[PDB]
Amino acid sequence: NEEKREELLEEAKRLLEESLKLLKQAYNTPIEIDLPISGGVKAILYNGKVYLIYENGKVEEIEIPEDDILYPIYNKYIETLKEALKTVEKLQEELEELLENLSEEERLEKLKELAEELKETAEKLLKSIEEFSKFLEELKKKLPKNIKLNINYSSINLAKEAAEKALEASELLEEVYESSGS
């Protein structure tokens, strides 16, 4: 049955690599929003900064006051993504060290710890994603019928797929832990 455990562990490692990749891509991917009644201006959200890019090619970095409704939600999303990136990289390093390596029961405990932290991080990320998506959908509802907002959900979908892959890896690690501790 150790071969089954090996298959599950390597699948979890693969899913963790994929999760880290998708998380870095999501952090790199900016949130684009074609602002309305502005002469085809696009509001780009990148690294906690807001940029207006005009059709002619002008780009202005606009500082958003801490009081606007968008700043807190977007910053919470950014910070959750950043913290998830750090946590996932830490857990990846720990799982690699585990696979390389003392005490089988301690390794079972370590796998349980890894999976629990992975699950918590994935669920917090999904929670932040849901909050930000609800905010954006309400923002688009607060608009006239003719006026339409075209948002590029690339980063949000990347983050959601990454959180789901992390959850899958966590549940695979949990299967390993259960089938081994018993």
Measured distance CA(158)–CA(180) in Å, rounded: 33
Q: Which residue's entry shows tokens 């906690």?
A: 48
Ramachandran assignment for 2, one of left (phi > 0), alpha (psi -120 to 50 degrees), beta (any other) = alpha
The total domain count for the chain is 1
| Segment 128-134 long-range contacts (CB within 8 Å, at least 24 positions apart) | 128/76, 128/77, 128/80, 128/81, 129/77, 129/156, 129/159, 129/160, 129/163, 131/73, 131/76, 131/77, 132/73, 132/74, 132/76, 132/77, 132/156
User: What determination technique applies here?
Assistant: X-ray
**Terminal-to-terminal C-alpha distance of the chain:** 13
In a domain, 103, yes or no: yes
Q: What stretch of H or E contains 35?
A: none
In a domain, 56, yes or no: no
In a domain, 177, yes or no: yes
DSSP per-residue letters across 52-84? EE-SSS-EEEEPPPTTSSHHHHHHHHHHHHHHH
Asked if 86 and 144 count as a contact pair (C-beta separation under 8 A), the reply is no
Q: Which pair of tokens denotes residue 76?
A: 């919470």
Say which amino acid occupies 128.
S
In a domain, 12, yes or no: yes
In a domain, 48, yes or no: no
Q: Which residue's entry shows tokens 């979908």?
A: 157
In a domain, 42, yes or no: no
Question: Can you give the length of the chain in residues?
Answer: 182
**Sign of the alpha-carbon dihedral angle for 54, 60, 61, 66:** negative
In a domain, 54, yes or no: no
Measured distance CA(39)–CA(112) in Å, rounded: 54
Q: Which residue's entry shows tokens 């999303």?
A: 77
Q: Which pair of tokens denotes residue 86?
A: 């750090």
In a domain, 55, yes or no: no
> Where residue 79 sits, what CATH number does that domain have?
1.20.120
Resolution limit in angstroms?
Answer: 2.8
Measured distance CA(77)–CA(71) in Å, rounded: 10
37 three-class SS: coil
Measured distance CA(117)–CA(34) in Å, rounded: 37
| Structural domain containing residue 11 | 2-29+66-142+153-181
Q: What angle do CA 144, 36, 148 make, to 5 degrees?
A: 45
